[PDB]
Copies of this chain bind each other. A is one copy, B any other.
């Protein structure tokens, strides 16, 4: 199904964001957010419904766990550096 295509793309994009965050390329991470918002809008046009196939349910669930884990991992790379540097100024 096609809505599975957008979850995949968001997972791929969030993995790219993670790679940038890993390299401390904050501006790239932000630049990836532009696509991210596009992808969420497109997601929003397909969803919700109609129900999903059991096979395609566990796949989306996985994709989500991955998107959320990526989102958490970006924050967990960036924020300790932000906190630290903020403390200084």
Contact = CB atoms under 8 A, between A and B. Distances in A.
B72 A26 contact: no
B37 A72 contact: yes
Interface string A71-89: 1101110111111011011
A: interface residue count bin: 35 or more
A34 B85 CA distance: 21
Nearest to A14: B71
Give 3 nearest A-B pairs by CB, closest first. Answer: A26-B83, A48-B61, A71-B71
B71 A26 contact: no
Interface string A34-53: 00110010011001110110
B44 A75 contact: no
